[PDB]
Ligand SMILES: C[S@@+](CC[C@H](N)C(=O)[O-])C[C@H]1O[C@@H](n2cnc3c(N)ncnc32)[C@H](O)[C@@H]1O
């Protein structure tokens with residue numbers, strides 16, 4: 001049963017049983033801002049709220065489970081002084097505190113492209129962070145393994161540090177992560193469901209979708225979007 | 240005058256006057272391994288160097304750090320993992336006052352079931368700018384530092400995949416950074432000079448070279464390599480001798 005719960009991710013995840021989730025693929029909610037350190041204070045207050053969700057994720061994740069976070073660093077130019085908040089970096093260092101093992105991230109190259117020194121380089125990438133729960137991975141059955149095997153060409157395209165062939169993140173981006181880090185039958189959660197990209201990706205490949213979304217309006221849009229992308233199946237929404 | 244001081248980055252940099260450096264390009268020393276402590280402690284050591292850099296840097300100048308995350312998989316415990324060195328350095332530089340800028344990704348290295356490990360292909364080129372106002376170069380500095388259109392668009396992009404790996408970094412990557420973030424005549428600093436790639440890169444492009452290197456044997460290799468790759472000029476190595 002593909003589920004999507006409406007409510008605060010921190011509260012909802014709190015009502016789920018430990019080690020019942022195999023994979024988390026998600027994108028942290030949008031964060032936007034006279035003023036000295038007032039900005040970084042709100043910034044670190046944001047991180048404090050994300051940490052609460054990551055902490056719950058570390059609980060409901062099975063050992064060997066993984067938390068995948070797709071994040072771009074928040075830039076702010078004309079304090080008109082150009083400044084970039086290193087979100088991906090902060091999230092990485094903070095997850096170590098929650099007990100996650102950090103793995104190499106995959107660089108999502110989203111945007112491909114007075115000539116004097118000092119020019120600002122435009123943002124072209126988002127980071128796909130990988131945080132693993134240690135302890136000793138579970139073992140999928142022979143059938144699960146066989147049905148989750150990736151064709152050679154897809155394997156070599158997916159498992160590389162930089163993805164430059166995928167211009168809310170795209171379904172194809174989510175389908176890759178679901179296929180790379182879970183097996184058919186596994187539960188794939190997204191604490192910040194949005195329009196349900198991850199749920200659609202998970203459901204589409206024989207995994208069980210489990211999501212949480214704050215705004216009830218978006219929850220409904222996802223169910224409809226879900227019913228279109230997942231022919232025959234439906235997205236159960238509750239509060 | 241291009242100089243290389245043989246000594247400890249923390250102590251040696253402490254003696255230089257504030258706001259006397261325009262650009263710092265460097266690669267922190269090799270990190271080798273409870274273990275998080277050895278790690279957090281190494282980070283603490285590095286911070287003592289960044290602190291001096293922030294003071295030594297003129298407003299608007301920057302600290303460029305090329306680091307690859309240290310993967311020590313299947314080693315200690317019974318699992319693979321990676322120390323996010325680049326991420327830890329980025330967070331810690333903010334606490335020191337630096338303005339974080341977007342990093343450049345150096346694409347160094349260009350079953351079939353779920354869970355496979357992805358091998359390291361990249362290194363990070365961290366950019367930490369010291370706030371304090373824009374920069375102020377002469378007209379001749381602008382005319383002589385101005386980059387041709389083709390080069391500008393080849394350098395000012397977030398991913399570099401045209402510079403093959405293998406001295407944590409090539410002369411081409413250093414020379415590229417020097418042309419992008421300093422002006423002819425400025426002072427370029429590398430507190431961890433090693434064989435002096437940064438020093439050489441600065442000199443070949445009309446910038447004043449400055450550096451620190453703990454190992455005299457490396458500094459000497461630096462002096463000789465410099466002289467080899469910097470015709471007409473020599474690298475002055477200062478032990479600090481007297482008498
Ligand atoms: C980056 S978006 C998710 C996008 C995903 N790629 C998709 O296609 O849906 C983050 C979501 O978190 C929601 N949000 C913000 N604060 C929340 C909270 N405390 N609990 C749950 N959702 C929250 C926002 O409404 C938003 O839809």
Ligand SMILES: C[S@@+](CC[C@H](N)C(=O)[O-])C[C@H]1O[C@@H](n2cnc3c(N)ncnc32)[C@H](O)[C@@H]1O
Nearest residue numbers: 247248266267268406431432433434435436453
């Ligand atoms: C990654 S290497 C720099 C290599 C450089 N890219 C080159 O072309 O040789 C770091 C350097 O820092 C030096 N080092 C380590 N600890 C130091 C310290 N406390 N003070 C000064 N140098 C130190 C090491 O001897 C080493 O050569």
